[PDB]
Write a protein that binds this ligand. Structure first.
Ligand SMILES: Cc1cc2nc3c(=O)[nH]c(=O)nc-3n(C[C@H](O)[C@H](O)[C@H](O)COP(=O)(O)O)c2cc1C
Length: 145
């Protein structure tokens, strides 16, 4: 069984580069237009909209508009199981804040955060963490009595 993975990456392609390094297959949310997915997934997304030294989870701009639109589709949203976020620690209290926003507002675990295209340690930690994450779903199977 392949873990479900969905990501967004802008013209700078840093999240795309991270996903390529992961060695796990993934579906990219496009710059424009609707897509749909069919099986449970973890979302990897970068953070935009920074600037506010004392930020608030509800202030808009952190989550890419294409991700908001993707998650407005009830079926896509129903299949979201967790989030991994990227950013730049120079943003301080706003570092990787899209992960905070998605995890709190969609009620899913915040699995990991990283900077830019990620380090080798980030790649390894995400590969191991995703494996452990999907294994934990096997603790939730229906009764077969
Ligand atoms: C306009 C703009 C705003 C950004 N705002 C934040 C931010 O609030 N917090 C953060 O951690 N990174 C912020 N970043 C850094 C990006 O999240 C980072 O460069 C990321 O790697 C971009 O991913 P992408 O190349 O896949 O689009 C911002 C970058 C830009 C260009």
């Amino acid at each position: 069984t392949v873990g479900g993975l969905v990501y967004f990456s802008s013209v700078s392609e840093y999240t795309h580069r991270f996903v390529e390094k992961l060695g796990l297959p993934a579906t990219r949310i496009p710059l424009h237009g609707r897509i749909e997915v069919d099986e449970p997934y973890v979302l990897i997304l970068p953070t935009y909209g920074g600037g506010r030294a004392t930020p608030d989870i509800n202030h808009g701009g952190y989550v890419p508009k294409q991700v908001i639109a993707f998650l407005n589709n009830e079926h896509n949203r129903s299949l979201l199981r967790g989030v991994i976020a990227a950013g730049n620690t120079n943003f301080g209290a706003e570092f990787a804040y899209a992960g905070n926003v998605v995890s709190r507002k969609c009620g899913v675990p915040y699995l990991y955060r990283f900077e830019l295209m990620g380090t080798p340690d980030d790649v390894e930690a995400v590969r191991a963490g995703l494996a452990d994450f999907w294994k934990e779903q096997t603790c939730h199977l229906p009764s077969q009595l």
